[PDB]
Design a protein around this motif. Structure first.
Motif, PDB file in Angstrom:
ATOM      1  N   UNK A 184       0.811  -1.212   0.000  1.00  0.00           N
ATOM      2  CA  UNK A 184       0.000   0.000   0.000  1.00  0.00           C
ATOM      3  C   UNK A 184       0.848   1.266   0.000  1.00  0.00           C
ATOM      4  N   UNK A 185       2.132   1.161   0.331  1.00  0.00           N
ATOM      5  CA  UNK A 185       3.004   2.326   0.331  1.00  0.00           C
ATOM      6  C   UNK A 185       3.135   2.905  -1.072  1.00  0.00           C
ATOM      7  N   UNK A 186       3.204   4.234  -1.143  1.00  0.00           N
ATOM      8  CA  UNK A 186       3.359   4.953  -2.399  1.00  0.00           C
ATOM      9  C   UNK A 186       4.450   6.002  -2.246  1.00  0.00           C
ATOM     10  N   UNK A 187       4.909   6.515  -3.389  1.00  0.00           N
ATOM     11  CA  UNK A 187       5.988   7.496  -3.382  1.00  0.00           C
ATOM     12  C   UNK A 187       5.582   8.762  -2.640  1.00  0.00           C
ATOM     13  N   UNK A 188       4.371   9.259  -2.896  1.00  0.00           N
ATOM     14  CA  UNK A 188       3.899  10.446  -2.190  1.00  0.00           C
ATOM     15  C   UNK A 188       3.766  10.172  -0.698  1.00  0.00           C
ATOM     16  N   UNK A 189       3.210   9.012  -0.346  1.00  0.00           N
ATOM     17  CA  UNK A 189       3.109   8.633   1.057  1.00  0.00           C
ATOM     18  C   UNK A 189       4.490   8.523   1.684  1.00  0.00           C
ATOM     19  N   UNK A 190       5.444   7.955   0.945  1.00  0.00           N
ATOM     20  CA  UNK A 190       6.811   7.847   1.439  1.00  0.00           C
ATOM     21  C   UNK A 190       7.403   9.221   1.718  1.00  0.00           C
ATOM     22  N   UNK A 191       7.250  10.145   0.772  1.00  0.00           N
ATOM     23  CA  UNK A 191       7.817  11.474   0.940  1.00  0.00           C
ATOM     24  C   UNK A 191       7.185  12.186   2.126  1.00  0.00           C
ATOM     25  N   UNK A 192       5.862  12.080   2.262  1.00  0.00           N
ATOM     26  CA  UNK A 192       5.191  12.707   3.393  1.00  0.00           C
ATOM     27  C   UNK A 192       5.664  12.110   4.711  1.00  0.00           C
ATOM     28  N   UNK A 193       5.823  10.788   4.763  1.00  0.00           N
ATOM     29  CA  UNK A 193       6.251  10.150   6.001  1.00  0.00           C
ATOM     30  C   UNK A 193       7.656  10.587   6.385  1.00  0.00           C
ATOM     31  N   UNK A 194       8.581  10.587   5.423  1.00  0.00           N
ATOM     32  CA  UNK A 194       9.942  11.010   5.732  1.00  0.00           C
ATOM     33  C   UNK A 194      10.051  12.510   5.958  1.00  0.00           C
ATOM     34  N   UNK A 195       9.038  13.287   5.576  1.00  0.00           N
ATOM     35  CA  UNK A 195       9.034  14.719   5.836  1.00  0.00           C
ATOM     36  C   UNK A 195       8.276  15.104   7.097  1.00  0.00           C
ATOM     37  N   UNK A 196       7.363  14.256   7.570  1.00  0.00           N
ATOM     38  CA  UNK A 196       6.563  14.530   8.757  1.00  0.00           C
ATOM     39  C   UNK A 196       6.946  13.618   9.915  1.00  0.00           C
ATOM     40  N   UNK A 197       8.217  13.248  10.002  1.00  0.00           N
ATOM     41  CA  UNK A 197       8.656  12.414  11.106  1.00  0.00           C
ATOM     42  C   UNK A 197       8.603  13.209  12.409  1.00  0.00           C
ATOM     43  N   UNK A 198       8.310  12.566  13.539  1.00  0.00           N
ATOM     44  CA  UNK A 198       8.419  13.271  14.818  1.00  0.00           C
ATOM     45  C   UNK A 198       9.858  13.676  15.091  1.00  0.00           C
ATOM     46  N   UNK A 199      10.014  14.781  15.812  1.00  0.00           N
ATOM     47  CA  UNK A 199      11.344  15.311  16.066  1.00  0.00           C
ATOM     48  C   UNK A 199      12.098  14.413  17.039  1.00  0.00           C
ATOM     49  N   UNK A 200      13.425  14.538  17.017  1.00  0.00           N
ATOM     50  CA  UNK A 200      14.306  13.718  17.845  1.00  0.00           C
ATOM     51  C   UNK A 200      14.080  12.236  17.563  1.00  0.00           C
ATOM     52  N   UNK A 201      14.165  11.875  16.285  1.00  0.00           N
ATOM     53  CA  UNK A 201      13.873  10.525  15.837  1.00  0.00           C
ATOM     54  C   UNK A 201      14.903  10.081  14.814  1.00  0.00           C
ATOM     55  N   UNK A 202      15.031   8.765  14.684  1.00  0.00           N
ATOM     56  CA  UNK A 202      15.944   8.133  13.741  1.00  0.00           C
ATOM     57  C   UNK A 202      15.120   7.271  12.801  1.00  0.00           C
ATOM     58  N   UNK A 203      15.333   7.449  11.503  1.00  0.00           N
ATOM     59  CA  UNK A 203      14.689   6.607  10.509  1.00  0.00           C
ATOM     60  C   UNK A 203      15.457   5.302  10.375  1.00  0.00           C
ATOM     61  N   UNK A 204      14.722   4.202  10.241  1.00  0.00           N
ATOM     62  CA  UNK A 204      15.303   2.874  10.125  1.00  0.00           C
ATOM     63  C   UNK A 204      14.667   2.152   8.950  1.00  0.00           C
ATOM     64  N   UNK A 205      15.505   1.624   8.064  1.00  0.00           N
ATOM     65  CA  UNK A 205      15.076   0.875   6.888  1.00  0.00           C
ATOM     66  C   UNK A 205      15.743  -0.493   6.956  1.00  0.00           C
ATOM     67  N   UNK A 206      15.075  -1.436   7.609  1.00  0.00           N
ATOM     68  CA  UNK A 206      15.615  -2.780   7.731  1.00  0.00           C
ATOM     69  C   UNK A 206      15.490  -3.516   6.405  1.00  0.00           C
ATOM     70  N   UNK A 207      16.594  -4.115   5.968  1.00  0.00           N
ATOM     71  CA  UNK A 207      16.647  -4.874   4.723  1.00  0.00           C
ATOM     72  C   UNK A 207      16.197  -4.013   3.544  1.00  0.00           C
ATOM     73  N   UNK A 208      16.977  -2.960   3.293  1.00  0.00           N
ATOM     74  CA  UNK A 208      16.724  -2.081   2.160  1.00  0.00           C
ATOM     75  C   UNK A 208      16.907  -2.798   0.829  1.00  0.00           C
ATOM     76  N   UNK A 209      17.534  -3.975   0.831  1.00  0.00           N
ATOM     77  CA  UNK A 209      17.716  -4.735  -0.401  1.00  0.00           C
ATOM     78  C   UNK A 209      16.448  -5.445  -0.854  1.00  0.00           C
ATOM     79  N   UNK A 210      15.350  -5.333  -0.103  1.00  0.00           N
ATOM     80  CA  UNK A 210      14.125  -6.039  -0.462  1.00  0.00           C
ATOM     81  C   UNK A 210      13.615  -5.605  -1.830  1.00  0.00           C
ATOM     82  N   UNK A 211      13.675  -4.310  -2.116  1.00  0.00           N
ATOM     83  CA  UNK A 211      13.237  -3.790  -3.405  1.00  0.00           C
ATOM     84  C   UNK A 211      14.066  -4.383  -4.540  1.00  0.00           C
TER      85      UNK A 211
END
Lengths: 53, 40
Positions: B1-28
Motif C-alpha cells: 500500500x506504500x506509495x511514493x507520495x506517502x513515502x515522501x510525506x512520512x519522511x518529511x513529517x517524522x516526529x522530532x528527535x527521531x531516527x529513521x530505520x530501513x531494515x533490509x533495504x535490499x528487499x526492493x
C-alpha cells in the motif's frame, strides 16, 4: 445591509488563516491546540504549543 | 500500500528527535526513482 464572501481550498485560504491567527483583536469563541517542538539550537529542546482558533 | 507520495510525506513529517530505520533495504508500490529522490 450586510455583505459576505466565501472561499475554500485556495492559495489565499492558508494565507487568510495565518492572517487571522496573528491578529491581536481576535475574539475567538472557539479554540484549538497545535503542539510543536521548540529547539533552542543545540543548547536544549523542549515541547510547546499554540492555541490556534 | 506504500506509495511514493506517502513515502515522501512520512519522511518529511517524522516526529522530532527521531531516527529513521530501513531494515533490509535490499528487499526492493514504491518506485526506485521515487525512493532515490526521497533519500537525496
Amino acid at each position: 445591509i450586510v455583505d459576505l464572501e466565501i472561499q475554500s481550498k485556495d492559495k489565499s485560504y492558508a494565507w487568510f488563516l495565518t492572517w487571522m491567527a496573528k491578529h491581536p483583536q481576535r475574539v475567538s469563541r472557539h479554540l484549538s491546540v497545535r503542539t510543536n517542538y521548540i529547539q533552542h539550537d543545540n543548547g536544549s529542546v523542549s515541547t510547546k504549543f499554540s492555541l490556534v482558533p | 500500500n506504500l506509495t511514493d507520495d506517502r513515502l515522501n510525506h512520512l519522511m518529511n513529517n517524522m516526529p522530532e528527535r527521531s531516527i529513521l530505520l530501513l531494515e533490509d533495504i535490499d528487499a526492493a508500490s514504491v518506485t526506485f526513482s521515487g525512493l532515490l529522490n526521497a533519500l537525496d
